[PDB]
Amino acid sequence: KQAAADRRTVEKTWKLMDKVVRLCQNPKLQLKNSPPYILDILPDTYQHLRLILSKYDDNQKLAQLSENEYFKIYIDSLMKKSKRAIRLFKEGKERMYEEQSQDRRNLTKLSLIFSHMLAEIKAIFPNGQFQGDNFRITKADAAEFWRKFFGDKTIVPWKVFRQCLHEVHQISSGLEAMALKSTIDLTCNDYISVFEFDIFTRLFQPWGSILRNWNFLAVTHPGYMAFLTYDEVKARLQKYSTKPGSYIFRLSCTRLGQWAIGYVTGDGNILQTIPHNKPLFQALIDGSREGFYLYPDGRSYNPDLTGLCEKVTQEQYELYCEMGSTFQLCKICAENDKDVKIEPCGHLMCTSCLTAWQESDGQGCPFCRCEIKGTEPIIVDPFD
């Protein structure tokens, strides 16, 4: 449960965000000015919160704002992520000044989360006023699914979302559900907002085959580059500037819900196209036919996508999850966090999954089958 998001609670997030900005201003970090840039995002998040407060301009309106389900979750998540960034610096020490460290990679994961939370609050409280209950999902067939299972909710727990999505599009494993959570839960708060749902269904449309589109285009396609800036697209394609037709497709933290396809022209330049609210596989098929998109990430083989007009290893899901924040999630159910450690193997899972395995007379540890000599309750952090 989350506390009421009253003025005092909102101001506590500002004080935590101020500490994060000051830690990130350390000259030793050499933090680059490129999206997601925490030094721009946190001041812009304070400004949007200030704008919301200015619209709920009396004690009656403040009381209604403080009990809004989405706003309580947002403020609780912002508090947690800001505390996590402070803890990152406290535990990371001198490794924060090494650009290639896992600690600095974790700061990039948090910067992406802050960027996505700012985009989310701007979409749910446009001009500072709550419109979550009136949110217009871009694809009507996706909107009908959200209205059927969640009515006019602005946000729902991941556990409930996953179970309901499975009733329409079957998810075949815990690892697939984990990769799917990492893809949709962009704010990494264990909830799916109607805004996060809108982004996912725009990217992986058409709705009728959404999980096939996602498994093919994001999890296994060699052209997929996840969140990149244009400087990063150029750096990836530069080595293929003498191979016209070399291409990649990326997500953009400043253009959520849209793809950007970077490609090498016949004259060796690197350009990009933003497909116009149409399926990505159709833009890639058309571009292949026209001779523009031939070699994904410069590779000799371009996967045939025509099966998407009318498969994934457990390793492929694992590799896809590396950039995300799902280490704390139980890999067996992909719906509860890891809360038990087995001795002596050290494997982690939720107690509900371990109990189910033991009640089935499963041999030892669910993962490695070794004898369980003891168990211990544990708390797992996404950056452990």
Ligand SMILES: Cc1cc(C(=O)Nc2cccc([C@]3(C)CCNC(=O)O3)c2)nc(C2CC2)n1
């Ligand atoms: C260039 C770059 C890009 C990314 C990056 O896109 N992060 C990311 C974070 C969370 C979720 C995702 C999803 C949507 C799902 C899991 N796998 C994906 O490919 O996309 C990506 N991260 C980093 C470093 C690790 C912080 N660097």
Ligand code: NA
């Ligand atoms: Na979320």
Ligand SMILES: [Zn+2]
């Ligand atoms: Zn579990």
Ligand SMILES: [Zn+2]
């Ligand atoms: Zn084990």
